[PDB]
Amino acid sequence: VAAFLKNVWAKEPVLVASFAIAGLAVILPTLSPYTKYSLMINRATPYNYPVPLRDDGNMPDVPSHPQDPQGPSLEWLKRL
Amino acid sequence: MNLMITLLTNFTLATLLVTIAFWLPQLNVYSEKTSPYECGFDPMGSARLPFSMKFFLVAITFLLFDLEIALLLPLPWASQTTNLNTMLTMALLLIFLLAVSLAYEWTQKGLEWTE
Amino acid sequence: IMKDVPGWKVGESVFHTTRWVTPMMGELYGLRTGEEILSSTYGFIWYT
Amino acid sequence: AKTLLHQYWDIPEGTECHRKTYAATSIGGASGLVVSAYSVALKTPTSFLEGVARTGRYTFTAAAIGAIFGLTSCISAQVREKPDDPLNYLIGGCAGGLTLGARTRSYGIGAAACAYMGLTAALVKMGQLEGWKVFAEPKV
Amino acid sequence: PGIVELPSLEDLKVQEVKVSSSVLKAAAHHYGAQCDKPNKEFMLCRWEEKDPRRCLEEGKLVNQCALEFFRQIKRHCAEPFTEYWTCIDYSGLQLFRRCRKEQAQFDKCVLDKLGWVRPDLGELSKVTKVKTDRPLPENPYHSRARPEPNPEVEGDLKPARHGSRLFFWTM
Amino acid sequence: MNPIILIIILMTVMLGTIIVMISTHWLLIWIGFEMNMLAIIPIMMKKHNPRATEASTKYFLTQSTASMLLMMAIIINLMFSGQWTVMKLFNPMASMLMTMALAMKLGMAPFHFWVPEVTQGIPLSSGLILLTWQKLAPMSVLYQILPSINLDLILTLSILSITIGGWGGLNQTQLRKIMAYSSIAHMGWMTAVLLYNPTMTLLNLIIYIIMTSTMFTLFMANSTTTTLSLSHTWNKAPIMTILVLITLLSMGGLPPLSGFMPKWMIIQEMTKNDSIILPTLMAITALLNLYFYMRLTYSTALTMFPSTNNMKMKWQFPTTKRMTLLPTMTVLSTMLLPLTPILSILE
Amino acid sequence: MSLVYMNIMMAFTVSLTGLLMYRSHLMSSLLCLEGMMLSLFILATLMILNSHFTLASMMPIILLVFAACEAALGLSLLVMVSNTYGTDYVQNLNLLQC
Amino acid sequence: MMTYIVFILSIIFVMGFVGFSSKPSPIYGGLGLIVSGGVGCGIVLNFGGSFLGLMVFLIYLGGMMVVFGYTTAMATEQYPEVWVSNKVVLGTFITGLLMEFLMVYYVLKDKEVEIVFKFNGMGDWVIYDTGDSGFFSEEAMGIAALYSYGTWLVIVTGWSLLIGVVVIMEITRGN
Amino acid sequence: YPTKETAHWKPPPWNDVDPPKDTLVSNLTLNFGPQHPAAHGVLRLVMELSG
Amino acid sequence: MMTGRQARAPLQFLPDEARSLPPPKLTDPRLAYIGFLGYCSGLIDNAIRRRPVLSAGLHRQFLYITSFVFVGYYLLKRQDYMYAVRDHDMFSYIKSHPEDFPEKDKKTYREVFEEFHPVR
Amino acid sequence: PFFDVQKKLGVDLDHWMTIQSAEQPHRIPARCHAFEKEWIECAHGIGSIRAEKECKIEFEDFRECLLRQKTMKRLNAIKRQRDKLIKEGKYTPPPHHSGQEDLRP
Numbered sequence A: 001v002a003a004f005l006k007n008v009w010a011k012e013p014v015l016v017a018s019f020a021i022a023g024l025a026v027i028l029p030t031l032s033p034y035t036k037y038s039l040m041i042n043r044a045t046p047y048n049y050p051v052p053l054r055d056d057g058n059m060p061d062v063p064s065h066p067q068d069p070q071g072p073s074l075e076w077l078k079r080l
Numbered sequence B: 001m002n003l004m005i006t007l008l009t010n011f012t013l014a015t016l017l018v019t020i021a022f023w024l025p026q027l028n029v030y031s032e033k034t035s036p037y038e039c040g041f042d043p044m045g046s047a048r049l050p051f052s053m054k055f056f057l058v059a060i061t062f063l064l065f066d067l068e069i070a071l072l073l074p075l076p077w078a079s080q081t082t083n084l085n086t087m088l089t090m091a092l093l094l095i096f097l098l099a100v101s102l103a104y105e106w107t108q109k110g111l112e113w114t115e
Numbered sequence C: 001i002m003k004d005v006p007g008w009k010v011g012e013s014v015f016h017t018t019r020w021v022t023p024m025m026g027e028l029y030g031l032r033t034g035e036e037i038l039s040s041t042y043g044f045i046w047y048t
Numbered sequence D: 001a002k003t004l005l006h007q008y009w010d011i012p013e014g015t016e017c018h019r020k021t022y023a024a025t026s027i028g029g030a031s032g033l034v035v036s037a038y039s040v041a042l043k044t045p046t047s048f049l050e051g052v053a054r055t056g057r058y059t060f061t062a063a064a065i066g067a068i069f070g071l072t073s074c075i076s077a078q079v080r081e082k083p084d085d086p087l088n089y090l091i092g093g094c095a096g097g098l099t100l101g102a103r104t105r106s107y108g109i110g111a112a113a114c115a116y117m118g119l120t121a122a123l124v125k126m127g128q129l130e131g132w133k134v135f136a137e138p139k140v
Numbered sequence E: 001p002g003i004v005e006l007p008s009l010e011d012l013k014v015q016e017v018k019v020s021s022s023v024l025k026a027a028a029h030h031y032g033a034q035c036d037k038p039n040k041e042f043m044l045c046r047w048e049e050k051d052p053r054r055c056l057e058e059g060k061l062v063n064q065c066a067l068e069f070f071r072q073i074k075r076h077c078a079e080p081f082t083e084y085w086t087c088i089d090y091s092g093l094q095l096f097r098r099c100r101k102e103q104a105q106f107d108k109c110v111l112d113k114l115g116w117v118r119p120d121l122g123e124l125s126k127v128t129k130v131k132t133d134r135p136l137p138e139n140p141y142h143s144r145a146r147p148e149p150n151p152e153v154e155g156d157l158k159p160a161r162h163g164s165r166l167f168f169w170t171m
Numbered sequence F: 001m002n003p004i005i006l007i008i009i010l011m012t013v014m015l016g017t018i019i020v021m022i023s024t025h026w027l028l029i030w031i032g033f034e035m036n037m038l039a040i041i042p043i044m045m046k047k048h049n050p051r052a053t054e055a056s057t058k059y060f061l062t063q064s065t066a067s068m069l070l071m072m073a074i075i076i077n078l079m080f081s082g083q084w085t086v087m088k089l090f091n092p093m094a095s096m097l098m099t100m101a102l103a104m105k106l107g108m109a110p111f112h113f114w115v116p117e118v119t120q121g122i123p124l125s126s127g128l129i130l131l132t133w134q135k136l137a138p139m140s141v142l143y144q145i146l147p148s149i150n151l152d153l154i155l156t157l158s159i160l161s162i163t164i165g166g167w168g169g170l171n172q173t174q175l176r177k178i179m180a181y182s183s184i185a186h187m188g189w190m191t192a193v194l195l196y197n198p199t200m201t202l203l204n205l206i207i208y209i210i211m212t213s214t215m216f217t218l219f220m221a222n223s224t225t226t227t228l229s230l231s232h233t234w235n236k237a238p239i240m241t242i243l244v245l246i247t248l249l250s251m252g253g254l255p256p257l258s259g260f261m262p263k264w265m266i267i268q269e270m271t272k273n274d275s276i277i278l279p280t281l282m283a284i285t286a287l288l289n290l291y292f293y294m295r296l297t298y299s300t301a302l303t304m305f306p307s308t309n310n311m312k313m314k315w316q317f318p319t320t321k322r323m324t325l326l327p328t329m330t331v332l333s334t335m336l337l338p339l340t341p342i343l344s345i346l347e
Numbered sequence G: 001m002s003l004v005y006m007n008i009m010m011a012f013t014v015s016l017t018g019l020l021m022y023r024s025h026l027m028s029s030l031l032c033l034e035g036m037m038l039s040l041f042i043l044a045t046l047m048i049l050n051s052h053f054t055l056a057s058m059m060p061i062i063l064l065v066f067a068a069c070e071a072a073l074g075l076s077l078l079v080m081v082s083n084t085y086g087t088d089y090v091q092n093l094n095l096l097q098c
Numbered sequence H: 001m002m003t004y005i006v007f008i009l010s011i012i013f014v015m016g017f018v019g020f021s022s023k024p025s026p027i028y029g030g031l032g033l034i035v036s037g038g039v040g041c042g043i044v045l046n047f048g049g050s051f052l053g054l055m056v057f058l059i060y061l062g063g064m065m066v067v068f069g070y071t072t073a074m075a076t077e078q079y080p081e082v083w084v085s086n087k088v089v090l091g092t093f094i095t096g097l098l099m100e101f102l103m104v105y106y107v108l109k110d111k112e113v114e115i116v117f118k119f120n121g122m123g124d125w126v127i128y129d130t131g132d133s134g135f136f137s138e139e140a141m142g143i144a145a146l147y148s149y150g151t152w153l154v155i156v157t158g159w160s161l162l163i164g165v166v167v168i169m170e171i172t173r174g175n
Numbered sequence I: 001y002p003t004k005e006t007a008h009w010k011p012p013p014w015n016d017v018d019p020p021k022d023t024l025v026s027n028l029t030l031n032f033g034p035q036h037p038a039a040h041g042v043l044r045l046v047m048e049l050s051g
Numbered sequence J: 001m002m003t004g005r006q007a008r009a010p011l012q013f014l015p016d017e018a019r020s021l022p023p024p025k026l027t028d029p030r031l032a033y034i035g036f037l038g039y040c041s042g043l044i045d046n047a048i049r050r051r052p053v054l055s056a057g058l059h060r061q062f063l064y065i066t067s068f069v070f071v072g073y074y075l076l077k078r079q080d081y082m083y084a085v086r087d088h089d090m091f092s093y094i095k096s097h098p099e100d101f102p103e104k105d106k107k108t109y110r111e112v113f114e115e116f117h118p119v120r
Numbered sequence K: 001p002f003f004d005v006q007k008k009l010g011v012d013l014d015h016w017m018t019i020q021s022a023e024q025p026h027r028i029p030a031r032c033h034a035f036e037k038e039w040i041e042c043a044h045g046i047g048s049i050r051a052e053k054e055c056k057i058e059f060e061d062f063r064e065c066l067l068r069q070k071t072m073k074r075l076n077a078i079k080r081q082r083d084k085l086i087k088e089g090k091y092t093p094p095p096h097h098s099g100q101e102d103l104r105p
């Protein structure tokens, strides 16, 4: 299979380069760990309005102020 | 509104130069000046004969590939989604299907011109 | 405007519900001049 | 083509021959127009004049069929004083068949059309009397 | 149908926060951090009952709160705020990143004078909980009574009576 | 043709049919129709003669125009409904346009002109694929929208196609034109009952598919395309003459053969709703269909037409054709009448 | 409804009468077919954009894709027809009449 | 008058449609369909969907140029009836234009017409919406969501196009 | 049933393949004449082309 | 007809409720008739290929009979289930709607009157 | 033959598109989302006959939200009467409909 690769690189190198680039683009998002950061960046973009929920009394996880400690923060987007 | 003003300004700039190119100079029009130009000799037949085309298959697949790239242009906005893996898979699969169609035409001598 | 026309009732809703509906573009600027019509309806699309 | 039939059927039979004659002539004219239009579409005439002549001949033939059918049926129901009877429509159908034979200039077509159109006209009167449905709405 | 309802013009009158969009955009984070409670009460009610005719007093209250915040701003740091919103307003797209110096100046003056800390990144998009005293609207959609559903098929499946019962077929 | 390409094209045709059959969206229905038509175009161009070009062009124009009417009806329903679900139509204009689109796709009179020409101009296998497979997706869509079809329009189309197919089948000596006119008559028979009981339409569809598949396989096995070519089978294989005799007897609705079961159940269902004139007219035009079937079976089975000298050379060689499922399909097309209450499984 | 709907369906009806009455040129009927698909596209996107059916914005792209696919099929069939006879006249397709 | 901008664009739309549906010559039919596609892109751009108008304009321009190449190869004759060169073409063009202007005059007088549906007389600015769209465009986001929602649509479209290439290559084979 | 209209209707061929009816293909005859930079001064190439 | 019945539970050849019914016997006349149809198809398969009809390929005729019997058995089970569900639905609807289905009181022949038409 | 495969298998192929009130990208609502919700919930599980008999009010109100026939009809009546009143000379438009009134916000 090395002789065939040498022949096809000697004859049509453009097709070899295109096949290599396409294979790289196919197999790289499977093995790369930075894609989840892109997912979270896309998720954490505020297009809508964050409507608040009615305080019945039993919801200590949801904050009452934007400066409260509880809630999803974006420190990792600053550090990365 | 500004785009129609711009288009109208360009159009009446273009049609002003043609209208002053038809009435200004002195004309000497005969029944020899306006004959078709065939390198000095009389033409042998009409210019409305069927001018046969050899690249018909490439034109048909140009239609199909133009529509393939028409489907492909929402990609910068589609990269702003949350279901990122499915979008990536469908984009890759569409482009791979385009390449498969091109390769099948290449292996079947479809891009080679007739005669 | 509607004083002489018989069989007319002002403020009539064409829907069968009492739910508030989004005001139609012609239901808001129906009686106003054409400059406001062009500024509100086609104003953003035409803007440069 | 629905309001023409309802314009024909609302008049009581054997009462006014002229309105029934006009209504049945309208039915015949509509039939002639649709038949002639299909004929010139499917079979191309030789020229413009031939096409309009064929169309006019067809609609005049069918208008004559309707006119004398309605006149004969209303006259028969008036003379006999029995309006809800298929016999009047049988004579009307035979008179129409004789008219078709005169329009085609043949006696065999005239006799066959008399027999068959009399049978169909009598059956139409029977269906109008007993409410027979051809395009019957679903029930079960 | 029914005559549509509409509040009178005396119910809609209010003092207006008459400032440009650059004034709002410059002090957007301080306004969001300081005046969260009437804004969020108004937003919760407006999203809950889906009616602007029933959501008027809260709009009145949010206008008073925004005007009070701006009147507090005018008393202490009028000149750094003036320079800051001018530097915002020069930009065509009103970029935040072209006026970081006026950002620091306004932030320092406000923090030393009144003690307001700007929200961090991702904080003003947080979803909060609001405690209010209005009752929950039972029917915001004004839905009528739903039609009765079809009865459900029940019972054990017995064999067919006398088979097929189709013409002459005995089974 | 490359067999890999042929297999891919056939699976794509089947995929378009099931995409129509399983979808809950009008746009997906339309997509399935388009992909089916554009994948069955080259099957009709397998032999590359001018008649195949004519048949493909006429079929393409008819199916294209029908698809345009289908899309217009879909868009009008979207306008007046705001949704896309495959159910009844919320506009009579959309219902009428959809009914005419599916009639043009089914080859129903007075949109019946393309069917004998397209059937004649293409090979026997492509004609079989057409007349059996392509006549399922319009029937499925018609099964979906039966609350919205105008009764007068569909009954006019049904009796018109029955009369026109029965009349046109009397003047043909080619087998494919005969089969196309018979197909027109059978679609009239099925859609006359669709608004009353669609299970009857499904049963008629299944029996007609089985019967016409058996006959097309018989014609392929004997390699005859004209009646005078069919008349040589008694000198070639008399058992095939017996088979075409019994299948032509069944195709005319002659009891006690299985082809009479659909017409019998149509008459049974349509008289529960007090419609008596219509099934009688359909019975008489079925008699016309039985007439040209009788003419064919006089030509091929009950007489011995003169043969030629090279038939001896054909005697010396046994057949090696791939007559797939021919005996099973012949048995199902002939003797399925004592198993009539099997039709309840289609409910 | 709106009068823009009137003009769009009226254009559709014009191109429908154009397609159904031939003028001895198959390619002109193909052009009328593309006109009908363009009218369908315009009508669909007008109602979709007016009623704010945002998820249905992907539909007319697909409809125009299949329009062009069937147009390419029509052009290929026209190449075959013009390679058999001298021209593309629709009266030459009369072999299947006997 | 300017409030009737989409009305004027739709009248140019129908004018081009009746110009090229007379079938004078496929060159002039191509010119007419180019005009109709451009003004339809204009119509749907005032309705807000600029991307859809640009795509339909680009796609139809490419298709019209390829078919222009085809008719210069295949559908041409000695003396093409460009316009006015044939009686029936000029007659049907005048008939269509007269009918269209007749119904425009009718709807601009009674402000209501009944051809099979019922059409109103005002401009189509009334049926717009008074709200804002925020920080996104609805049409662009829908065709973006084609990738993340419509995987089945992508699969059937790509498969149909690939077998369409196969279909057109195995049609123009000759044997 | 033969009639006046159905008089010229021949049956189709046994193989359903017609002869190709080869009409003249009308090759375009260009004139690479003397007033041309390609022709070296004076050369009248009468040229029959298929496109 | 029963589309709304088989609407919430789609594409089931034979639901769970079909097992409450007696299965057909292996000596069903219908199943024996389907096996006979398979035997006839085997004879035709032998006949059209110019083989001896009653002797050639006994394994083929056995497979024909067996496949016909199998498929016919399942089809008969479905048919009996559909008739059972039809009757059950009909009786449940008759029970649920007592107004639309009155109890007719039959009268004996001493109370009725029927016109006599003599033949002479 | 509506061989419904999607509910049998549990996958969805075109269910997300078929109605106007389904899930949208970042929850963009349609113009008549509420009316479609009301008509859908009115006519669920009762069949088409009972849908056209027992949800006629909801369906016709939703259809009036879609095409807006009666809204433009009333607007046409108001516009025509105002034009006739202006031409005849019994009406004068108020200053806030003329071009300036020191607008509210």
Ligand SMILES: CCCCCCCCCCCCCCCCCC(=O)OC[C@H](COP(=O)(O)OCCN)OC(=O)CCCCCCCCCCCCCCCCC
Residues within 6 Å of the ligand: A008, A012, A015, A016, A017, A018, A019, A020, A022, A023, A026, B096, B099, B100, B102, B103, B106, B107
């Ligand atoms: C898995 C990766 C992603 C795959 C999907 C995406 C693909 C993107 C690129 C699309 C390319 C489309 C066109 C492909 C055409 C191939 C067939 C062809 O035409 O081959 C011809 C060529 C020899 O040229 P010739 O015979 O003279 O051609 C006639 C005139 N030129 O023949 C050749 O040169 C040989 C062609 C076949 C062998 C190519 C080997 C490339 C190897 C690259 C390194 C390995 C990459 C990893 C993946 C494995 C790839 C096999």
